[PDB]
Amino acid sequence: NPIHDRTSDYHKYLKVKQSDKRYIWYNPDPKERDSYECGEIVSETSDSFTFKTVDGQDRQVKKDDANQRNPIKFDGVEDMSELSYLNEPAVFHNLRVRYNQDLIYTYSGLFLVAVNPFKRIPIYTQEMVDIFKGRRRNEVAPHIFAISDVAYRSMLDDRQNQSLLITGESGAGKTENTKKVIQYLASVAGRNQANGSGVLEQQILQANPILEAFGNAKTTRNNNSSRFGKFIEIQFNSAGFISGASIQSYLLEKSRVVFQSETERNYHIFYQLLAGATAEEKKALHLAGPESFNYLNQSGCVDIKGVSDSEEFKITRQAMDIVGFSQEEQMSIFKIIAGILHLGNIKFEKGAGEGAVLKDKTALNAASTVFGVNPSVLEKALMEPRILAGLVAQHLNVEKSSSSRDALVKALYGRLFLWLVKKINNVLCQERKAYFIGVLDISGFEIFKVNSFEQLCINYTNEKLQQFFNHHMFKLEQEEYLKEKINWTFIDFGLDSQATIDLIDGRQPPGILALLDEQSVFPNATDNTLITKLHSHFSKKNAKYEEPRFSKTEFGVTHYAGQVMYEIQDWLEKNKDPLQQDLELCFKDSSDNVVTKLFNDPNIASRAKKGANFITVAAQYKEQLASLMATLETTNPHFVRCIIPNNKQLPAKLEDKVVLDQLRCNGVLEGIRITRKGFPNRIIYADFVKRYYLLAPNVPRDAEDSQKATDAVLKHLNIDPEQYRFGITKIFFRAGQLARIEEAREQRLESN
Numbered sequence: 001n002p003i004h005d006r007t008s009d010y011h012k013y014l015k016v017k018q019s020d021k022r023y024i025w026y027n028p029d030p031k032e033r034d035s036y037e038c039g040e041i042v043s044e045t046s047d048s049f050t051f052k053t054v055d056g057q058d059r060q061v062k063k064d065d066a067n068q069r070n071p072i073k074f075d076g077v078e079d080m081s082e083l084s085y086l087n088e089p090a091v092f093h094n095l096r097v098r099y100n101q102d103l104i105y106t107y108s109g110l111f112l113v114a115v116n117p118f119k120r121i122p123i124y125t126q127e128m129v130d131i132f133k134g135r136r137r138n139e140v141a142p143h144i145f146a147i148s149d150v151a152y153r154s155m156l157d158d159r160q161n162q163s164l165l166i167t168g169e170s171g172a173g174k175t176e177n178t179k180k181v182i183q184y185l186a187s188v189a190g191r192n193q194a195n196g197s198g199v200l201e202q203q204i205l206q207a208n209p210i211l212e213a214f215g216n217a218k219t220t221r222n223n224n225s226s227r228f229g230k231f232i233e234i235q236f237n238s239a240g241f242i243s244g245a246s247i248q249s250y251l252l253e254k255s256r257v258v259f260q261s262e263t264e265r266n267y268h269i270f271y272q273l274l275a276g277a278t279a280e281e282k283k284a285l286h287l288a289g290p291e292s293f294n295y296l297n298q299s300g301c302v303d304i305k306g307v308s309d310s311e312e313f314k315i316t317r318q319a320m321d322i323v324g325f326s327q328e329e330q331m332s333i334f335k336i337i338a339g340i341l342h343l344g345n346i347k348f349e350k351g352a353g354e355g356a357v358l359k360d361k362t363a364l365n366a367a368s369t370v371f372g373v374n375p376s377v378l379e380k381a382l383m384e385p386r387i388l389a390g391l392v393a394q395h396l397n398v399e400k401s402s403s404s405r406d407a408l409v410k411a412l413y414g415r416l417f418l419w420l421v422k423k424i425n426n427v428l429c430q431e432r433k434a435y436f437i438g439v440l441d442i443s444g445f446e447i448f449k450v451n452s453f454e455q456l457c458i459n460y461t462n463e464k465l466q467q468f469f470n471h472h473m474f475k476l477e478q479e480e481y482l483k484e485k486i487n488w489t490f491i492d493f494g495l496d497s498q499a500t501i502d503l504i505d506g507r508q509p510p511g512i513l514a515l516l517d518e519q520s521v522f523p524n525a526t527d528n529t530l531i532t533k534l535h536s537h538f539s540k541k542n543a544k545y546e547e548p549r550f551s552k553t554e555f556g557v558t559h560y561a562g563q564v565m566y567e568i569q570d571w572l573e574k575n576k577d578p579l580q581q582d583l584e585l586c587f588k589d590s591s592d593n594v595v596t597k598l599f600n601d602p603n604i605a606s607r608a609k610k611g612a613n614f615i616t617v618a619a620q621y622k623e624q625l626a627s628l629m630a631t632l633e634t635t636n637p638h639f640v641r642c643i644i645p646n647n648k649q650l651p652a653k654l655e656d657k658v659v660l661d662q663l664r665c666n667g668v669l670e671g672i673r674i675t676r677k678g679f680p681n682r683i684i685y686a687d688f689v690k691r692y693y694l695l696a697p698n699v700p701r702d703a704e705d706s707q708k709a710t711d712a713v714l715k716h717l718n719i720d721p722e723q724y725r726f727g728i729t730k731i732f733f734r735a736g737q738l739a740r741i742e743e744a745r746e747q748r749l750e751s752n
């Protein structure tokens with residue numbers, strides 16, 4: 001039995017190897033709430049603690065705001081819910097104790113938390129794989145394999161699709177753990193020797209460098225940030241063999257193509273192409289350095305420390321070779337990327353009149369060449385599009401025409417992104433599936449210095465997914481209480497998120513997105529009109545809304561992860577998404593095979609179209625979110641949280657400020673908040689008696705009636721009866737009660 005043999009590798013790499021004072025976690029600087037020091041408690045009141053700081057000073061904290069340290073027996077628990085003092089620095093502390101012993105996987109209730117070790121740990125060998133084949137969560141130690149295996153067994157046993165919601169930015173090990181999930185499924189889903197899903201495993205993983213190049217960018221927070229969300233399906237036939245894979249992509253931050261904030265970058269692919277292309281490629285596409293393109297030079301950043309964009313281009317090209325893109329398709333792909341940049345170098349100049357003119361036509365001709373369109377047709381389609389009056393030319397002014405040029409750049413880039421996913425799906429999905437195990441990968445919760453419409457949609461997606469988690473926790477907790485016949489009554493945890501979701505997207509009262517859709521069609525609405533309408537509806541009316549005293553262009557939303565303030569500039573223009581038909585007819589006529597598909601395929605083109613009208617981005621956004629949540633509610637969900645230990649790519653250096661910030665955003669701390677309100681610590685009686693038979697007189701270590709023996713210990717210790725409940729198999733304890741009993745045990749054996 002490797003699981004029970006303590007000489008085994010399983011116990012060496014996945015299990016834990018092992019004073020009287022009381023300490024408390026505290027913040028030396030209260031403004032830095034995630035940086036903690038340990039302090040000794042010295043005095044005690046009815047309402048407070050007094051503790052010594054590391055420098056020897058004395059401090060008072062009210063007992064209701066104190067983050068007590070857990071007794072050492074709690075150090076290394078496989079589930080955070082096993083901690084008695086369940087608070088933020090105590091949870092981080094448990095993570096540190098396990099990280100320094102190379103235990104990178106820890107449960108937090110339903111969550112599997114995975115911290116990137118920045119070093120190879122030998123826990124993914126085939127012997128390891130064998131350990132987890134067929135095992136349930138509580139039979140083995142925390143491991144990504146355990147989540148994969150539980151999901152696989154339930155898929156066949158319940159004949160139900162499964163979802164795996166996973167969070168983590170570049171550097172947290174999310175890509176690695178997703179690859180581990182795929183390879184574990186592939187290992188057990190096939191025959192032990194003759195499984196034949198080797199090519200598909202290669203193509204799924206090689207799909208990632210491609211969408212990373214076109215969909216990831218450098219933000220102020222991360223060098224490789226996913227500006228789109230995706231759902232990856234591991235598909236199975238009815239017998240449980242891997243049958244294929246699919247990728248579903250959600251809205252992309254196409255506004256990033258035309259605009260980047262200071263010190264940020266456009267999507268990687270532009271810098272890869274300009275840096276990695278051959279001399280004959282550059283001339284053919286009329287390329288220059290990033291400095292020479294307005295779409296790449298407005299930010300002051302064109303390179304990433306320690307990232308070679310030419311080397312990255314060869315990796316992306318190689319990836320495209322592998323997933324099936326032909327040389328003709330790859331060259332058309334970069335013609336489009338090259339064309340987009342050329343489009344952005346067009347300078348529309350103010351003519352002597354209302355309409356705009358184009359003095360220099362160099363950029364227009366360079367774009368028409370690589371796109372395969374007629375420069376004159378494009379020129380008029382941009383500056384003099386035709387509308388209807390039972391077709392009427394309409395001369396446009398400068399920014400009216402620059403904005404339509406931008407709209408073409410966004411539509412071109414966005415449709416190209418959808419086409420890449422469709423092409424990758426072509427080699428990944430060649431069989432109708434029976435079941436799927438789906439990996440959800442959305443842009444994580446975001447707080448920039450200036451947060452705009454995109455951030456409200458991103459954080460709203462996380463807000464609804466955190467509620468999805470909270471409701472699932474609720475039903476599993478109810479199941480646990482009645483199976484134990486614990487008389488405790490809690491309301492649905494999902495409803496704590498409901499105020500914030502109603503504020504963003506409710507129907508009556510109308511939420512922010514509905515008020516935005518309304519203002520977008522009101523003739524003379526501005527952004528000032530929009531935010532005023534927002535304040536009128538919500539300031540001092542929705543409890544999660546805030547009208548700031550300081551600024552007149554910002555509104556605040558209180559998410560599960562904290563408060564975020566959104567600047568309202570350009571929300572109406574961002575919500576409106578037109579493309580003039582003259583532009584679309586001009587590119588339907590193109591001589592390039594890939595470009596034509598972008599405007600002729602009713603799936604790539606005609607995306608969220610509405611009978612000769614384009615719907616709003618908020619409308620497009622709600623459509624995708626509602627369909628995702630519908631798919632998700634049919635599945636059995638599992639949750640994985642990937643964490644960056646630090647920002648220095650360093651092994652064995654876990655930093656509280658870095659880690660804690662992520663656990664707030666990814667929902668783990670929200671789950672902690674709910675767990676600590678109830679009865680987290682649940683002990684089988686015989687175990688409680690065995691540990692604490694010596695705190696009460698005349699209690700045998702192995703009592704026949706442990707229920708009675710536990711009541712003896714609790715009564716003798718004068719434990720507050722409000723702090724525990726008696727189950728049929730276990731005793732339920734409130735936060736802190738088990739720690740005090742543990743302390744009492746320490747002192748008594750201290751004295752011995």
Ligand SMILES: Nc1ncnc2c1ncn2[C@@H]1O[C@H](COP(=O)(O)OP(=O)(O)O)[C@@H](O)[C@H]1O
Pocket residue numbers: 116117118119120121169170171172173174175176177224
């Ligand atoms: N569990 C792990 N064990 C060892 N190395 C890891 C693990 N997870 C991630 N890494 C390493 O850390 C880096 C970041 O991984 P990851 O975040 O998954 O990739 P990306 O940055 O592309 O998202 C990679 O170079 C990988 O080698």
Ligand SMILES: Cc1ccc2c(c1)C(=O)[C@]1(O)CCN(c3ccccc3)C1=N2
Pocket residue numbers: 227228229230250251252253254441442443453454457458461617621624625628
């Ligand atoms: C399930 C779902 C549905 C819609 C989504 C997302 C996920 C995202 O994560 C994003 O892909 C992150 C970028 N983004 C976005 C960009 C511009 C405007 C609105 C949303 C997203 N919308």
